Amino acid sequence: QKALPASLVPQAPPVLTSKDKITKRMIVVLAMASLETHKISDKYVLLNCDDHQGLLKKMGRDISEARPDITHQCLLTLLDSPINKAGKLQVYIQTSRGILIEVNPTVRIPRTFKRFSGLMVQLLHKLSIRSVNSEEKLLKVIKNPITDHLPTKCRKVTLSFDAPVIRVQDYIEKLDDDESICVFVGAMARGKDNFADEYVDEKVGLSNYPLSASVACSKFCHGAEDAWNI
């Protein structure tokens, strides 16, 4: 009795940004990312655990906290997840130095590491990155706090290991038709999972094992895909 749509040819999904605070989506926030740049005399680099013996110790910090590889391999996982292709996700990151970066769904993050390093240098110093086709602007540093950009109806949870463990599928179908889900995952190597106490009302976890960062991201994304039938 119910008719078809008038057009069966599949449109691309509408790519969502911070200029659409209405649509239900999944925000993933990579917190405490290690994205800092530094001078060599002549050259700029992104601070690794491996490009130096003691540039980090000359800057004062310890070398174990200069890990951009793990926010790289989280960003790859989130932007190759099917929910990003279906257009129900956008990726915000926030550096441990307090710099918020909005990551478009339409971006193609480069697959090797030092290509991503050379991308992050120009992002951190030019505050904006255009496409090669130069029609839109698809990786940009925006203004803190993140709650100015998150949707107006959005439950904000954070991910940890010591928390009441839930299942992502029934947890996401608990929330209602216009509520989004903002999942603060920590992109540290180690640290207390308190990076977003001031934004978050629910601190949850996914396993009973010490869960890696991109594995936690992929677990929450696959649960969201099953909950939204993707």
């Binding site: 691309a12 339409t106 971006v107 050379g118 991308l119 120009q122 992002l123 990155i129 086709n133």
Partner: protein, 51 residues
């Protein structure tokens, strides 16, 4: 979702300017900046030794 490739220069340097692919407009911008700083320094120095 469509997937665009990001445009960025390799071995980026903020202190150096961007590599324009024209050697007769990057050159005029370079030498405009050069005449501005040398003219400013020159007439600053001649008015302060006049003082």
């Amino acid at each position: 979702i469509p997937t665009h490739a990001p445009k960025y220069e390799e071995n980026f340097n903020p202190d150096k300017k961007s590599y324009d692919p024209d050697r007769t407009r990057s050159e005029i911008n370079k030498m405009k900046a050069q005449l501005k700083k040398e003219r400013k320094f020159t007439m600053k120095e001649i008015r302060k030794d006049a003082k």
